[PDB]
Design a protein around this nucleic acid. Structure first.
Length: 175
RNA sequence: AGAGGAAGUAGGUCUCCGUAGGUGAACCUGCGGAG
């Protein structure tokens, strides 16, 4: 019998207040968004550390910013991953124009480039300041990561998007 | 004015907060801070 307790941010608190994981994984849960913790606990009906770990990754990813749709998608697909990238990782210039300009290049007006790479490379992204979070198969995740570091490197969205699309095609192809 | 003669050129998204107004709990818009 194992339990695991996860802390949350105060951002998504009403989304958590909206309403099942006991029915999902037969795994008993307590919650308190004032101590910012949630308690996953293995009962006699939960059978696997994989069920424990995937419920943990599920709740922590919904905390880290995605919604219930891609959350239960993470719950369903076992081959489906999340990753947390900081923009303070590998840095081309030492000037502190890093946050605003690079995330302007990346997200763009009305999230057009963001949603564009989401639809073009089959992944799902959330942007939270210095921390961005990729969700997908690990190929899509690493691909989105290279697109992110190139759009902070300084290539225009046109060229990085075109290369992104063509490698999306050659990645999707079986033969 | 004259018909002739002759020649030549054709780029800040999502969420949270603090605001001001709006139709008020909420909620929307505008502004300013955080992930």
């Amino acid at each position: 019998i194992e339990t695991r307790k996860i802390p949350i941010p105060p951002h998504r608190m009403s989304a958590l207040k909206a309403n099942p994981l006991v029915d999902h994984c037969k795994l008993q849960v307590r919650m308190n968004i004032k101590e910012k913790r949630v308690e996953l606990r293995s009962s006699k009906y939960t059978v696997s550390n994989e069920a424990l770990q995937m419920g943990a990754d599920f709740v922590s990813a919904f905390a880290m910013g995605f919604d219930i749709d891609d959350a239960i998608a993470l719950l369903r697909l076992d081959s489906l991953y999340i990753q947390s990238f900081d923009i303070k990782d590998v840095r081309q210039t030492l000037g502190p124009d890093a946050l605003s300009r690079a995330i302007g290049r990346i997200a763009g007006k009305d999230g057009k480039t963001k949603f564009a790479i989401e639809n073009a490379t089959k992944t799902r992204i959330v942007l939270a300041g210095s921390k961005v979070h990729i969700l997908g198969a690990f190929e899509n995740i690493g691909m989105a990561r290279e697109s992110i570091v190139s759009l902070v490197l300084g290539a225009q969205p046109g060229k990085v998007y075109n290369n992104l699309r063509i490698i999306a095609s050659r990645m999707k192809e079986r033969w």
